[PDB]
């Protein structure tokens, strides 16, 4: 390199000498402690399973931003004074958190639902890559979205396709394990998720099927079980009490959020309503027709034959009718499925999960 | 040097200076705490019978998406998901599900359901992604949900507590390996006894394909274990597996192993090396007395 | 390479920093959990050596004289365990131990609902801002400003928005502590550990703390609990202890948050830990006309719009519910692609949001008294 | 603690009024009759909030009406409403 | 077009010579606007527009052309539309001249501001500590509308402040009348009466409106420069040099050079603090070829008499040599061997800046490596990192060369670091730029950290807001450091909200050529922005940034009176309608010869025609 002659000459002379001064303050235990609090007089607090007792004073190489209250640091060999700092990476010791991956997703199988597909894209995907329109208008966009209905029918599969359309960091947090019989574990782990991840702007947290939290009835705090009502009280702090700049986004898709809803949603932090809709003749063709793009079957059978008369078969119902009819034809080692497997797969799906209330006329 | 140092290796360190001298040994043999992962278990072909209709169903469940998953993308469909198997009590279903990993050229991972539930700071919440790392290390493996399964008569497998949280965890697991990873080499097989607390959110067309029912015990089903366990157990040639089974009742998979165990205790009184049909009738009524209780 | 050359003057100054360490070089090498030193070599009675740990627990009855000449040995001597006071030699005492504290700076929140808060905010100003202006009127008249105050109503419709907006104009220390995480497990984690924050409030002045999530703290009991809520109830009683014997009201303020006023212990709601209550309900029509103005100050609107007919479509509501009308109105300019905010966008939004979108899921009959 | 009567609430208010500067127009038996089932914790808030009414009026000392205005302060839900009275 | 200086070093500009020669068939005038420019030969420019057979395209040939600025506005190139407006051979539209020379556009830009409305300002108030800062942003918020009617109500504008803060006054409120032709009536009312020091800085606010219209002046500005010189206290005349200096943006004029020549010939530094006119001459000749200014500069060297002992005016000639020769390349070769012939104790610390200005936007390895041994010298720095302002690739290999501006045992080297990444991103914000702000004024010497908050407003040119919202209200608590440090904070807020927040200097151009006037005024301020830096100079070095400020345009017009809805991918709206602002995004439908950003004439099928 060019500067290795001129500029490096009054450089390496002091670069090697300071390393010897490091060996004086380092040695090679490099004890890893924990810094509880920063003192303006440059003094620290040692932490270790051996119960250390030290007055150690904060040395150089660290600054006020690098030193953190309760993250590990490097210590001196004899005096045990603070020297360096530990670098955090990989998986933290907090609750389950995904890091990153790039999924392959688009709008294909959920085609025909575009009436409600372009609605969620306006409040989620658009206010991400184009951080504008809020300077001229001045209205804050909503935070998350709330979806209630039958998941996996293309309503929740819609959220799976939006996750890839963001082209950014996506987070998925489990909302089940909070219901543990222990009291007080709910509000703890939830706060540490959004606090540590606040550095990365994109989050878009998704949660599925919470049937527990939300017991209120006539009063705000009842004499019911404490494993439930207090766990929800943490979500009020995230959506109301302490609000971010629009980084964290919470999404919850459950069966019926009715009783659950107005303890959380608030008027205007999160505005979304999406319910499972019975597809019409046009929507059923786009759902079933696109699934057959890569599928091969008998050219003498029309895909719209069973579309005319059918009872509430969504994309989830078709996913099995394609697999059930596929495994029967694969037994003979053929890529095409006959017509008998089409009606045979529809019956067992309609006779199991699909049941009406036997309410006629009205 | 630093290039030859592998992660997690036993080395030597000085006393006062703590300086690294030389590499002594390698990574320890025992892994984690309790490892129930077993490849090619003691059950290979015939251990628990009744596999006539069971092999035919499980063949299109595990083998196809694991061995050659490209057959599904060529046909145009996607991979299936976990299957639920239920049957009558007195079976050994837990031991029966362990033989699924034999013909499929994979491993078998067993996960404790009740031990997954944890108080204080939840460990099971992290144990989901901890076992996901173990599932990531070994692709040819089958993760099983235990302690929620049926080894016999079972009433309540889930409730408002942590018991039903094990089945609700599968909601985020099926979305992790598909809606996130978009690659799944591992099928998680469930188990149960009766149908009571299963919600419509857990049972979906393509999350759970079919719930397999096991055949009830009968005259031919009482000789199930008698045609297998009799190999390692000493008997005589006057032992008719079908005729002696006609004198028994309510014993197919699990209890026949217990009746054959009680037959060994009766031979200890006579102190002989054989067990005849006379010692079988003593174990027919004694085992049924414990089942009729409660 | 700033840090590379910064250590050049720092290592040379490290010896100067070591010069202060040269006072006591024994035992190798201000917030503290418990006071701990090594042997306290420095130190009626003359020298004073006390340490509390797993080895060599010390106690001394006398004190208040100069043995050490200020700091000695492990540098940590002072308040821990309570019961223990080294004062006379420049103490590092009453200092926060290892704990979890949420401390932020400048919680900036603008005005939200001024409709019914005209004289209602003035009651909040009489809490904090009042003793910070003319304290002489307190001694002459014989009256004291309110300390404890209660917030009840729907979950953040412009009630909570007003709580965080007034705190920004106080220009003091802001600390947020909630009640949900407060439970934990160990006895004292939710009381004694928080008592250290209450004890520090009397030490460090100009501190303001808003108590949050009192539904997870207080509440009324009939069978006296099903278990596990005793420490939850003891924390309620621990808050009384700090207000029991003695406490100044100048530098310490108390504010709660909940959805209903009387759901607490009827003994807890008794006065003296709450001087005044914040009554938050649906204000009148013309009072909220300024809310439509606040959201339109930074919003481009077509000249000639009439807000009189827009307010008629909207019944009694709150501040946040009015922003939802403008929020969807901003979305009318997204899809339909409107240049500015027109009158037809606002007239339709009320029927689109309140009538159309809102429907069910709102707080109506859930507050009476209890 | 029993429910303080007329003469009982008077002696309690005399304790918190020692540091209060009044106009000597107050009748102790007059204010206690308007109060019912108000313990000393609620009686203390009357003397504290009495001077706050005179704060906006700029009065140098509280008067007999200011103590009645202490009841007008919102504690027991004494505030106003609509309909039958306006 | 944009790939000319990519793989090879920019040894020859020959790639910019013949380009439009391919377009001789259909006459593509879009990317052919800037070809022969930056050389100084304008004969090939007029031959490009001689192929036009289309009378309709001349409406589209106005906005895209006049955006060329420096190398356009020269006499006869800006009037090329007005030369044939009477007798039309190619049917050049007469209204196109008014679209080129910005006489009309002040009316159409004012009508377009009613879409997003605005926030007005008034009442400079009081507190001289904050009063100089109060009127700084007060004038920049009102650009595009006249709020000055309320300013006239004020009697004494400061009356508290002494020094140069009392001198420059109108410059704060003069930005309201910028480009405004009708605003000159109320602007001239600040001449008479007022205050003696306020009258001194009256010309500095007048020259703001004359930038770019210098060829379309209805009144000569040469007499206005001399009127303030004849006044008593000749130091006022030196403060009035920068008054017309903001108006130096425009064509090449020898009348303003002939008047300022004898002013620099008086050469009394210590007495009246004057003869600084040579510093403002850098903005006179830009993009053209002339050597006249260099002649008067050479004779001021050898003197070094007792009157010349001032160490400031000697340093003012270093920046003037680099701005005049920037982007030329023809007469720069003669200068490299000119000044180097005569040797002085301080010589190579100046002339080396001219050698780096021959090519702007692309780094030269030969020039960078040669200046490393010479510096290891005050103005020899900027001729290294400022070579390429348009190339971020050269910064990755120069990361160790940027280290030459930071870590050393000398604290004076850390003073010049803020201008490394600040001059490149001054037009448009970037990612890793704002991350440079950590700790500045907490060091020992106060003169080391200056441009810190200065670069916050410079790099803040952009949309209504920026990434400084974290430190926006944090800088207000630093008033206890230095008295002038509080006004430094306002310098950032003024450039963020400049021109109602929507008007900033940017790199957007239809010819893909950076603005020379914008880079000239920014380079005009190099070492220090204020007086207390080193010796006493002036506080008037701020307002010079108003020379190259012009509102940008994104609109689709088939006719000047018939607009049409546009579509732009920006949004939360998505594909927003006409009358708003966007950033570097195209449209949907197909126009005739271009389909680019800016003003473009559209066309539709008469069978099926979409009408708004």
Swiss-Prot record, chain A:
Cross-link Glycyl lysine isopeptide (Lys-Gly) (interchain with G-Cter in ubiquitin): located at?
A: 160, 181, 216
What keywords were assigned to this record? ATP-binding, Cytoplasm, Isopeptide bond, Lipoprotein, Myristate, Nucleotide-binding, Nucleus, Proteasome, Ubl conjugation
- The record lists ATP as bound by 149-156
* Chief location of this protein within or outside the cell: cytoplasm
| GO biological process per UniProt | nonfunctional rRNA decay; peptide catabolic process; positive regulation of protein catabolic process; proteasome regulatory particle assembly; proteasome-mediated ubiquitin-dependent protein catabolic process; protein-containing complex localization; ubiquitin-dependent protein catabolic process
Location comes to: Cytoplasm; Nucleus
Protein's UniProt name: 26S proteasome regulatory subunit 4 homolog
Q: Which residues of the full protein are shown?
A: 75 to 436 of 437
GO cellular component terms, A-Z: cytoplasm; nucleus; proteasome complex; proteasome regulatory particle, base subcomplex
One function term, GO molecular function aspect: ATP hydrolysis activity
User: What organism, scientifically named, is this protein from?
Assistant: Saccharomyces cerevisiae (strain ATCC 204508 / S288c)
**Which family does the record claim for this protein?**
Belongs to the AAA ATPase family.
- Domain of life, per lineage: Eukaryota
Disulfide bonding pattern of the chain: none
Q: What is this protein's function?
A: The 26S proteasome is involved in the ATP-dependent degradation of ubiquitinated proteins. The regulatory (or ATPase) complex confers ATP dependency and substrate specificity to the 26S complex. Has ATPase activity.
Curated annotation (Swiss-Prot), chain B:
User: A cellular component term (GO) from this record?
Assistant: nucleus
Please verify whether the record's keywords include Signal: no
Name the UniProt key words of this record, in alphabetical order: Acetylation, ATP-binding, Cytoplasm, Nucleotide-binding, Nucleus, Proteasome
Q: What is its main location?
A: cytoplasm
* GO terms assigned for molecular function: ATP binding; ATP hydrolysis activity; proteasome-activating activity; protein domain specific binding; ubiquitin protein ligase binding
Summarize the PTM comment: N-acetylated by NAT1.
- What S-S linkages are listed for this chain? none
Q: Where does ATP bind?
A: 87-94
GO process terms (BP)? chromatin remodeling; nonfunctional rRNA decay; nucleotide-excision repair; positive regulation of RNA polymerase II transcription preinitiation complex assembly; positive regulation of transcription elongation by RNA polymerase II; proteasome regulatory particle assembly; proteasome-mediated ubiquitin-dependent protein catabolic process
Top-level lineage group: Eukaryota
User: Can you say where in the cell this protein is located?
Assistant: Cytoplasm; Nucleus
Q: Which family does it belong to?
A: Belongs to the AAA ATPase family.
* Assembly information from the UniProt record: May form a homodimer or a heterodimer with a related family member. Interacts with OLA1, TMA17, and UBR1.
Other noteworthy facts:
Present with 4700 molecules/cell in log phase SD medium.
**What is this protein's function?**
The 26S proteasome is involved in the ATP-dependent degradation of ubiquitinated proteins. The regulatory (or ATPase) complex confers ATP dependency and substrate specificity to the 26S complex.
Name used for this protein in its record: 26S proteasome regulatory subunit 8 homolog
User: Which species is this UniProt entry from?
Assistant: Saccharomyces cerevisiae (strain ATCC 204508 / S288c)
The record's gene field reads: RPT6
Part of the whole protein covered: 103 to 396 of 405
Curated annotation (Swiss-Prot), chain C:
- In the record, which positions carry Phosphoserine? 67, 134
Q: What pairs make up the disulfide bonds?
A: none
Identify the domain of life. Eukaryota
Q: Has the keyword Nuclease been applied to this entry? A: no
Can you list the GO cellular component terms from the UniProt entry?
cytoplasm; nucleus; proteasome complex; proteasome regulatory particle, base subcomplex
- Give the similarity note: Belongs to the AAA ATPase family.
* Name of the protein: 26S proteasome regulatory subunit 7 homolog
Report the gene name: RPT1
UniProtKB/Swiss-Prot annotation, chain E:
Residues in PC repeats: 168-200, 201-238, 239-273, 274-314, 317-349, 419-450, 451-485
Q: Note the coiled coil stretches, chain numbering.
A: none
- Could you confirm whether the keyword Thylakoid appears in this record? no
Task: Tell me the superkingdom of the source.
Answer: Eukaryota
Q: Care to name a GO molecular-function term for this sequence?
A: protein-macromolecule adaptor activity
Q: Which GO terms describe its cellular component?
A: cytoplasm; endoplasmic reticulum; nucleus; proteasome complex; proteasome regulatory particle, base subcomplex; proteasome storage granule
Q: Name one GO biological process term.
A: proteasome-mediated ubiquitin-dependent protein catabolic process
- Which UniProt keywords are given for this protein, alphabetically ordered? Phosphoprotein, Proteasome, Repeat
User: What more is known?
Assistant: Present with 306000 molecules/cell in log phase SD medium.
Q: What does this protein do?
A: Acts as a regulatory subunit of the 26S proteasome which is involved in the ATP-dependent degradation of ubiquitinated proteins.
Q: Which family does it belong to?
A: Belongs to the proteasome subunit S2 family.
What name has this protein been given in UniProt?
26S proteasome regulatory subunit RPN1
Which gene name belongs to this protein?
RPN1
């Amino acid at each position: 390199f060019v500067s290795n002659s001129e500029i490096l000459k009054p450089f390496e002379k002091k670069q090697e000498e300071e390393k010897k001064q490091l060996e004086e303050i380092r040695g090679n235990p490099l004890s890893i402690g924990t810094l509880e609090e920063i003192i303006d007089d440059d003094h620290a607090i040692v932490t270790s399973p051996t119960m250390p007792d030290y007055y150690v004073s904060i040395l150089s190489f660290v600054d006020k931003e690098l030193l953190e209250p309760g993250c590990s640091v490097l210590l001196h060999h004899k005096t045990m004074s603070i020297v360096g700092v530990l670098q955090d990476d990989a998986d933290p010791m907090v609750s389950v958190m995904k890091m990153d991956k790039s999924p392959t997703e688009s709008y294909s199988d959920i085609g025909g639902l575009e009436s409600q597909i372009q609605e969620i894209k306006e409040s989620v995907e658009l206010p991400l890559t184009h951080p504008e329109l809020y300077e001229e208008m001045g209205i804050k966009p909503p935070k998350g979205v709330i979806l209630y209905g039958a998941p996996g029918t293309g309503k929740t599969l819609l959220a799976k396709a939006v996750a890839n359309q963001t082209s950014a960091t996506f987070l998925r947090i489990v909302g089940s394990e909070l219901i543990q019989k222990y009291l007080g574990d709910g509000p703890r782990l939830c706060r540490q998720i959004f606090k540590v991840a606040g550095e990365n702007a994109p989050s878009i947290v998704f949660i599925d099927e919470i049937d527990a939290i939300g017991t209120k009835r006539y009063d705000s705090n009842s004499g019911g079980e404490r494993e439930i009502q207090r766990t929800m009280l943490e979500l009020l702090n995230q959506l109301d009490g302490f609000d971010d700049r629009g980084d964290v986004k919470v999404i919850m898709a459950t069966n019926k959020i009715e009783t659950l809803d107005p303890a959380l949603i608030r008027p205007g932090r999160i505005d979304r309503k999406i319910l499972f809709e019975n597809p019409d003749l046009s929507t059923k063709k786009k759902i079933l027709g696109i699934h057959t793009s890569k599928m091969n079957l008998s050219e003498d059978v029309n895909l719209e034959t069973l579309v005319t008369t059918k009872d509430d078969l969504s994309g989830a119902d078709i996913q099995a009718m394609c697999t059930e009819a596929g495994l029967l034809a694969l037994r003979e080692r053929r890529m095409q499925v006959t017509a008998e497997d089409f009606k045979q797969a529809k019956e067992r799906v309609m006779k199991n999960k699909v049941e009406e209330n036997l309410e006629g006329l009205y | 040097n630093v290039k030859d140092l592998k992660a997690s290796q036993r080395v030597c360190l000085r006393s006062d200076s703590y300086m690294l001298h030389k590499v002594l040994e390698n990574k320890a043999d025992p892994l984690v705490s309790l490892m129930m992962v077993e490849k090619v278990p003691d059950s290979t072909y015939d251990m628990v019978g009744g596999l006539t209709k069971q092999i035919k169903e499980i063949k299109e469940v595990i083998e196809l998406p694991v061995k050659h998953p490209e057959l599904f993308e060529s046909l145009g469909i996607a991979q299936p998901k976990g299957v639920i198997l239920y049957g009558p009590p007195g079976t050994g279903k837990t031991l029966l599900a362990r033989a699924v990993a034999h013909h499929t050229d994979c491993k078998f991972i067993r996960v404790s359901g009740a031990e997954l539930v944890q108080k204080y700071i939840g460990e099971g919440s992290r144990m989901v992604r901890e076992l996901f790392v173990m599932a990531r290390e070994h692709a040819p493996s089958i993760i099983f949900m235990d302690e929620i399964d049926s080894i016999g008569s079972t009433r309540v497998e889930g409730s408002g507590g942590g018991d039903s949280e094990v089945q609700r965890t599968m909601l985020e697991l099926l979305n992790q390996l598909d809606g996130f990873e978009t690659s799944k080499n591992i099928k998680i097989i469930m188990a149960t006894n009766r149908l009571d607390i299963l919600d419509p959110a857990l049972l979906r067309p393509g999350r759970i394909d079919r719930k397999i029912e096991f055949p009830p015990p009968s005259v031919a089903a009482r000789a199930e274990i008698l045609r297998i366990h009799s190999r390692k157990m000493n008997l005589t040639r006057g032992i008719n597996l079908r005729k002696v089974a006609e004198k028994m009742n309510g014993c197919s998979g699990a209890d026949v192993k217990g009746v054959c165990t009680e037959a060994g205790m009766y031979a200890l009184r006579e102190r002989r090396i054989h067990v005849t049909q006379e010692d079988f009738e003593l174990a027919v009524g004694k085992v049924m007395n414990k089942n009729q209780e409660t | 390479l700033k840090q590379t050359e910064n250590d050049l003057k720092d290592i040379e100054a490290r010896i100067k920093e070591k010069a202060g360490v040269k006072e006591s070089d024994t035992g190798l090498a201000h917030p503290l959990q418990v006071a701990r030193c090594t042997k306290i070599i420095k130190g009626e009675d003359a020298k004073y050596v006390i340490n509390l740990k797993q080895i060599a627990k010390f106690v001394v009855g006398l004190g208040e004289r100069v043995s050490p000449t200020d700091i000695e040995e492990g540098m940590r001597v002072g308040v821990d365990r309570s019961k223990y006071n080294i004062e006379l030699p420049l103490p590092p005492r009453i200092d926060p131990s290892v704990t979890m504290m949420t401390v932020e700076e400048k919680p900036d929140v603008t005005y939200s609902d001024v409709g019914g808060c005209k004289d209602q905010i003035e009651k909040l100003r009489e809490v904090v801002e009042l003793p910070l202006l003319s304290p002489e009127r307190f001694a002459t008249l014989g009256i004291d400003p309110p300390k404890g105050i209660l917030l009840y109503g729907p979950p953040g419709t412009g009630k909570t928005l007003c709580a965080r907006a007034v705190a920004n104009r106080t220009d003091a220390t802001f600390i947020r502590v909630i009640g949900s995480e407060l439970v934990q497990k160990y006895v004292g984690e939710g009381a004694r550990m928080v008592r250290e924050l209450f004890e520090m409030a009397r030490t460090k002045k100009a501190c303001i703390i808003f108590f949050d999530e009192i539904d997870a703290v207080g509440g009324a009991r009939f069978d006296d609990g099903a278990g596990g809520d005793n420490e939850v109830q003891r924390t309620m009683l621990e808050l009384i202890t700090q207000l029991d014997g003695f406490d100044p009201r100048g530098n310490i303020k108390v504010m709660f948050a909940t959805n209903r006023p009387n759901t607490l212990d009827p003994a807890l709601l008794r006065p003296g830990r709450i001087d005044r209550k914040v009554e938050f309900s649906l204000p009148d029509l013309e009072g909220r006309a300024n809310i439509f103005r606040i959201h339109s100050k930074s919003m481009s609107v077509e000249r000639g719009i009439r807000w009189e007919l827009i307010s008629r479509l909207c019944p009694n509501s709150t501040g946040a519910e009015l922003r939802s009308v403008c929020t969807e109105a901003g979305m009318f300019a997204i899809r339909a692609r409107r240049k500015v905010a027109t009158e037809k966008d606002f007239l339709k939004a009320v029927d689109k949001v309140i009538s159309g979108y809102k429907k069910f899921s709102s707080t109506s009959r859930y507050m009476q008294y209890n | 603690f029993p429910l303080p009567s007329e003469d009982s609430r008077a002696q309690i208010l005399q304790i918190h009024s020692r540091k209060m500067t009044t106009d000597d127009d107050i009748n102790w038996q007059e204010l206690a009759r308007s109060t019912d089932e108000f313990n000393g914790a609620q009686l203390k808030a009357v003397t504290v909030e009495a001077g706050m009414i005179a704060l906006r009026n700029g009065q140098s000392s509280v008067k007999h009406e200011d103590f009645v205005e202490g009841i007008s302060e919102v504690q027991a839900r004494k505030s106003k409403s609509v309909s039958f009275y306006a | 077009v944009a790939c000319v200086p990519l793989l090879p070093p920019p040894e020859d500009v020959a790639f910019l010579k013949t380009a439009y020669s391919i377009y001789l068939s259909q006459n593509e005038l879009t990317d052919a606007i800037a070809l022969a420019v930056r050389l100084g030969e304008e004969d090939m420019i007029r031959s490009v527009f001689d192929a036009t057979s289309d009378p309709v395209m001349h409406k589209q040939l106005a906005y895209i052309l006049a955006a060329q600025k420096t190398s356009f506005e020269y006499e006869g190139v800006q009037d090329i539309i007005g030369n044939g407006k009477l007798s039309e051979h190619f049917l050049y539209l007469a209204k196109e001249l008014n679209l080129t020379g910005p006489k009309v556009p002040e009316d159409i830009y004012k009508s377009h501001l009613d879409n997003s409305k605005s926030v007005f300002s008034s009442a400079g108030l009081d507190s001289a500590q904050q009063n100089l800062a109060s009127s700084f942003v007060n004038g920049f918020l009102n650009l595009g509308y006249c709020n000055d009617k309320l300013i006239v109500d004020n009697d004494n504008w400061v009356y508290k402040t002494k020094g140069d803060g009392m001198t420059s006054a109108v410059a704060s409120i003069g930005s309201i009348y910028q480009w405004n032709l009708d605003g000159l009536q109320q602007l001239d009312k600040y001449l008479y009466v007022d205050e003696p020091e306020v009258k001194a800085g009256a010309l500095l606010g007048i020259g703001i409106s004359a930038s770019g219209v210098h060829d379309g002046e209805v009144e000569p500005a040469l007499l206005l420069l001399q009127d303030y010189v004849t006044n008593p206290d000749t130091k006022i005349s030196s403060a009035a040099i920068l008054g017309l200096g903001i108006a130096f943006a425009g064509s090449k004029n020898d009348e303003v050079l002939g008047l300022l020549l004898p002013i620099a010939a008086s050469t009394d530094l210590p007495i009246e603090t004057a003869a600084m006119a040579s510093l403002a001459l850098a903005h006179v000749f830009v993009g053209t070829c002339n050597g006249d200014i260099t002649t008067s500069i050479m004779d001021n060297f050898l003197e070094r008499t007792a009157i010349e002992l001032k160490t400031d005016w000697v340093r003012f000639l270093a920046l003037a040599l680099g701005i005049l020769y920037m982007g030329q390349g023809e007469q720069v070769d003669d200068v490299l061997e000119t000044i180097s012939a005569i040797e002085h104790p301080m010589t190579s610390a100046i002339e080396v800046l001219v050698g780096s200005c021959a090519y702007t936007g692309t780094g030269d390895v030969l020039l960078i490596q040669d200046l490393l041994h010479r510096l290891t010298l005050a103005y020899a720095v900027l001729g290294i990192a400022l070579i390429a302002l348009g190339e971020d690739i050269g910064k990755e290999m120069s990361l160790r060369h940027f280290g030459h501006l930071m870590h050393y045992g000398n604290e004076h080297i850390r003073r010049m670091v803020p201008l490394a990444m600040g001059i490149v991103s001054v037009s448009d914000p970037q990612m890793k730029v704002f991350d440079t702000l950590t700790r500045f004024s907490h060091d020992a010497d106060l003169e080391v950290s200056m441009n810190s908050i200065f670069a916050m407003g410079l790099c803040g040119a952009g949309t209504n807001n920026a990434r400084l919202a974290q430190l926006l209200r944090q800088l207000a608590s630093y008033y206890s450091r230095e008295q002038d440090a509080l006004f430094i904070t306002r310098l950032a807020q003024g450039l963020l909200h400049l021109g109602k927040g929507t008007m900033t200097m940017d790199v957007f151009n239809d010819a893909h050529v950076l603005n020379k006037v914008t880079l000239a005024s920014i380079l005009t301020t190099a070492v220090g922005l204020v007086s207390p830096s080193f010796m006493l100079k002036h506080h008037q070095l701020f307002y010079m940034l108003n020379a190259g400020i012009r509102p940008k345009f994104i609109l689709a017009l088939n006719d000047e009176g018939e607009p049409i809805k546009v579509n732009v991918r920006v949004g939360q709206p998505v594909l927003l309608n006409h009358g708003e602002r966007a950033e570097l995004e195209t449209d949907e439908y197909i126009s005739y010869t271009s389909h680019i950003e800016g003003v473009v004439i559209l066309k539709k099928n008469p069978d099926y025609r979409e009408e708004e």
